Design an enzyme around this catalytic site. Sequence first.
Site, PDB file in Angstrom:
ATOM      1  N   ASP D 164       0.851  -1.199   0.000  1.00 18.98           N
ATOM      2  CA  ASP D 164       0.000   0.000   0.000  1.00 18.98           C
ATOM      3  C   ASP D 164       0.882   1.244   0.000  1.00 18.98           C
ATOM      4  O   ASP D 164       0.605   2.223  -0.679  1.00 18.98           O
ATOM      5  CB  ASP D 164      -0.962   0.044   1.216  1.00 18.98           C
ATOM      6  N   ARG D 167       2.544   1.674  -3.431  1.00 22.74           N
ATOM      7  CA  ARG D 167       1.570   2.260  -4.340  1.00 22.74           C
ATOM      8  C   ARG D 167       1.469   3.771  -4.119  1.00 22.74           C
ATOM      9  O   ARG D 167       1.473   4.532  -5.062  1.00 22.74           O
ATOM     10  CB  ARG D 167       0.208   1.589  -4.155  1.00 22.74           C
ATOM     11  N   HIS D 191      -4.253  -3.656   5.950  1.00 23.99           N
ATOM     12  CA  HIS D 191      -4.108  -3.835   4.501  1.00 23.99           C
ATOM     13  C   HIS D 191      -5.469  -4.045   3.908  1.00 23.99           C
ATOM     14  O   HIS D 191      -5.961  -5.177   3.754  1.00 23.99           O
ATOM     15  CB  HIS D 191      -3.206  -5.017   4.200  1.00 23.99           C
TER      16      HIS D 191
END
Lengths: 330, 327, 330, 330
Positions: D164, D167, D191
């Site tokens: 995450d 990203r 998550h």
Amino acid sequence: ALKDQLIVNLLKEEQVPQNKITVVGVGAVGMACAISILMKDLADELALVDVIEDKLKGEMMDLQHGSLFLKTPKIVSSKDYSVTANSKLVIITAGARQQEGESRLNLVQRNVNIFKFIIPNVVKYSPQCKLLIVSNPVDILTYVAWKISGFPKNRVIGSGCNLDSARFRYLMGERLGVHPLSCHGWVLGEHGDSSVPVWSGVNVAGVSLKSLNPQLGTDADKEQWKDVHKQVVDSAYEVIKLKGYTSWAIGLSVADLAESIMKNLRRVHPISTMIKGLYGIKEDVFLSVPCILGQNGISDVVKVTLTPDEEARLKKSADTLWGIQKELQF
Amino acid sequence: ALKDQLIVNLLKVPQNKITVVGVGAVGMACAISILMKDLADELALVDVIEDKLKGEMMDLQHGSLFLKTPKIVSSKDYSVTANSKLVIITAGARQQEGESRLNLVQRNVNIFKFIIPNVVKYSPQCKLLIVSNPVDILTYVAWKISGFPKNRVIGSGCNLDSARFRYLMGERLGVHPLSCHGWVLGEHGDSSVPVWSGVNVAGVSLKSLNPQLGTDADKEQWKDVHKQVVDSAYEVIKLKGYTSWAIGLSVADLAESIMKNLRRVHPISTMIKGLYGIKEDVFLSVPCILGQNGISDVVKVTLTPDEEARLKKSADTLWGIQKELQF
Amino acid sequence: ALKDQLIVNLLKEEQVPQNKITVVGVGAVGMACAISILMKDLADELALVDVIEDKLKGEMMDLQHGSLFLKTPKIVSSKDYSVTANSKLVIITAGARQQEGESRLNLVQRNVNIFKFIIPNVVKYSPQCKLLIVSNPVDILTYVAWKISGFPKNRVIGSGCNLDSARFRYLMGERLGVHPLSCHGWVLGEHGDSSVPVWSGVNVAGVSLKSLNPQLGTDADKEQWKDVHKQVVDSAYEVIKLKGYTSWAIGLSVADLAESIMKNLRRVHPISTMIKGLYGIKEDVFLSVPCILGQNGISDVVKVTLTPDEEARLKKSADTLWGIQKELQF
Amino acid sequence: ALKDQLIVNLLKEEQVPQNKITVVGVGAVGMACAISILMKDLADELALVDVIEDKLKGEMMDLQHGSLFLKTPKIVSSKDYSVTANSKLVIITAGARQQEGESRLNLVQRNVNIFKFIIPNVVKYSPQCKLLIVSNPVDILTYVAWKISGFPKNRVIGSGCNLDSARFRYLMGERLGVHPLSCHGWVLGEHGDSSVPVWSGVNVAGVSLKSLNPQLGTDADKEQWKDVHKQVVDSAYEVIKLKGYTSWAIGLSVADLAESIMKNLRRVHPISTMIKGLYGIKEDVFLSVPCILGQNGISDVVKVTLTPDEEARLKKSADTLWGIQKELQF
Ligand SMILES: CNc1nc2ccc(NC(C)=O)cc2s1
Ligand SMILES: CNc1nc2ccc(NC(C)=O)cc2s1
Ligand SMILES: CNc1nc2ccc(NC(C)=O)cc2s1
Ligand SMILES: CNc1nc2ccc(NC(C)=O)cc2s1
């Protein structure tokens, strides 16, 4: 403390390195081995040992300052061998080096005396180590390391002709316009004057160059391929004459051997091992033959088929080296 | 011919060529690290001492089996440098024990009067990476002599100083330097500026946990970490006679950003005229975006009043030296 | 804009990539080529092209989200070949692939028709590229891509037997307890059922296994080494029978070839190229023979010395390929 | 035998690997972890385990066929966990995976049931391994593996928000024109949908984006940076819709974590761990905070200073996970 404000420790340490390498000697060879090993990500800990305190500390510091750019989180040094504890591989580069016009074989009594101190102190702290000898005369000093350490033969390795063959393959590559990786050929025997180019095995894509010209590497060879072997023999001396010493190539060659050991690759390398029982050799001679190299050192030896001439040249190298072994004073 | 018996030939310039000027310890550390990071398809070495040069070349060539740079060349003659994407200048008098890098300046300016036009002649579109000391002034000089636009004239600057700072911070904290963040800007030398305001782990400002961070009033004297950064070359020189490995690694990190067009941020030497409160053609280290066209953008770091003072002082010290120098 | 407060732009942004790779097809083969290429840091730009809009975008996005772990700063995709501009290497994996029990040769009509579209669009936007054909039947399609493209034959390369030889060397090393890197052996001819194992070149450390065991690879061989080549022929069909398709091995094989091309290595690989002129072959057959591969593609071909049977086998592979290729219209 | 004609064996070896990694589950996520760990030379042995025999053996073979191009000398697979013995790191990717539109939390009882079988088998054969949990929902499944394994909490790690945060950094990079490596920002907590972007720590070159734009990530944000975190939360759903699953980015993320562990790097990653005692959390909740990761797993936790709103979000994430976690049938 700032640290404890920032980080909660959750774990009582127990840091016992898992892939530790030691380099003994921080001269140009040893540091070339170090930077090469660092840049190939082979170790979780690197230790350096030498006898000149300031030189050693400065070399350690200079490497540490590059840590951001590396993946080896612990670099340490000491004159005291306890810093080498729990090494998987210990690389010995310490000792006298050959001058212009001096045979590597002239180094033997000086480096034996040094080894008498280094070897017992090395093996003391690393029960799982392999000993990779780089100091010269490398074949004789691998025998010496073996005898002093009392290690089994698979654990005592000489850098041997790994560089000579790399050089052979480079020079061949240049003649044929092919990358050295795709040029195959073995220089065996002594890492020095009596090394043996194995013409019968020299090939590109499995094509024997000798099959195409059976006079390859003889005085009759119209293209004088023997000169490639001569260049190999003279290489260390030519580089010594130009820049004072050699460092980079041997560093990379040693790193290549470290990689096979540390990563259990079982690649074949022409490196110094005991060859009692082959090619009519009946004594405990160490010299380069193709050996399978992995996590337990040399586990297997390739029996290279040699022509009668190649076999004679190898026995000749073996007699030379045995003759110097007989001068050894333990 | 054996070759013709073996191979049928069907077809009679390098695309990722790097040249290193100077085969001293810095130069050769640059060369080995570049070779071991597969950045170039050809490496050229240039120096003025013929035997030393050929020997280093040959010693590298002998390791080719273990490398992926298929052409390694050398000559005193700069025609060997032709078609270089990147040309790294390491030549000149090097820092001596107990002496500022600034003590080297005139002699290196003189040598650059020779080297730079020769580089520009054979690679008019290369990026120039200056490592020679004092790197900030010599980057300026390289820029003036070359006539290159400023994006293509880069000094190794504080990349290494910041690497050293992050190593030392990591050792204090028990964290890898990659995970310890912090910038040393300004002169690559004694007047460098640690930007305490930016120093962080996982985005957590260390100054937030210790407001006096890096001041005299800091109970844990983190200023000493910056002192260690400033003194590092002097100590290493004292111990082993020069520095090589850390700088080679630093220069290769920069060559990587350039050759791979990474657009990573590095504290490297560029013209800071009209930024951070500075009015003359001074080069010094600020965070720069580095890629295939060299330096394309500068990060405007928000400096405290002090940090800005120290930075302007570093600029003054350098323009002090640069002023009264002849070329 | 926050960007402008954060950053002062000093240079107008005329970006043109210098080491761009395109992969045509984002099926399992193409994406395996992509990830392997990305993990070997060979490219500064990766372009993907396919015809399924959603699948293409998703694959691109998934790669992009890994960018922190990579050193390829721009990843792009489109149905439109303008996305592929300025590529140095374009890798063609698109088209039909074989079902269980179906020859690669049965794909030829479908993939010729698709190549009529793909090849002119690639050449339109990447005038300097090399073409690496991976789509099957790879030997016939390299010939097709060559004809369509108007590229010289050096720049139109078939992945060929690079993978078959990698399989052979893996199987050989498994049998011998040696890393594949040190097991040498060439599989040539068609990437497919009519490939030829060159037993006369099979060696470790230059030692010919056929000289050790003359029966090597015949039906009289007591260790049945022919079973090794049969496993090589059958590999794709066995893996397709087990997991539905093959991907990882071919991706790695294609990445190996991309490395040699992008880094101008001049390594020798068994890959698809024109062999008219050799072995009595008269027509424009493309098959695998060992070629020197570099920045201008295949610059040289090694003339392997073949036994009478090996050569007869290579000529029969050529005949098989010609049998299909002679009927193509495009 | 030809092997014995060619090779002389010196010793019967300790064939116990030093750097063995096991991947449990050979669906898309497991195989992307596998190819990534192979291409980063992290292990000397890769073991694969799954329950579908045919797919398992096909994926093992496909990886095996690429060995020539790798440095991982043994790749094995079995439905039997004996194949995993002596693993330093076992990565669990097995179990039901998100369908399109499906919350990771919806996988929970199916995957707890699968883990009641998997975990004791793993622990039986590598009682000293680190466990890296990737299966979803990863935070709760790390708690489950910890409880079932009986391992100390440092050796049970969830892949967490590593992806995450990768990203987030990718997206910030494409907004600023900077490589993700030079954009810093942390996404913590679950998550999945309840993750927390820490706007206070978001920086380039130590420059806080919030200091420039005091309304960064808030509803008032002229430039809507909160959209960047929305895109992070939405990423897996978007990719699943487009290509049916996610693989490459998580493969790369897991490999990055494996690297820190295997090479003892002691880098900081936002990964799943017990946060009892932080942020007024009183229960055994597992979720992502910045963790120092090395050869003994998670040795330390960085205490991030969160705003009251950020902390409240994080405790919201904690409550959500604990609701499910606190009632698990096992
Ligand atoms: C015990 N005697 C010695 N140990 C050592 C260890 C390292 C070195 N270093 C070199 C470069 O020869 C020299 C010696 S002489
Ligand atoms: C006067 N021209 C010069 N060019 C060069 C090029 C390289 C070097 N080498 C070093 C290490 O100083 C010295 C000089 S002096
Ligand atoms: C007709 N043109 C086509 N171009 C392409 C490009 C890519 C693909 N994709 C695959 C995996 O075959 C299929 C086609 S069909
Ligand atoms: C019987 N328990 C299970 N073990 C495993 C191991 C691996 C997998 N694989 C996948 C793809 O979910 C599924 C299961 S279900």
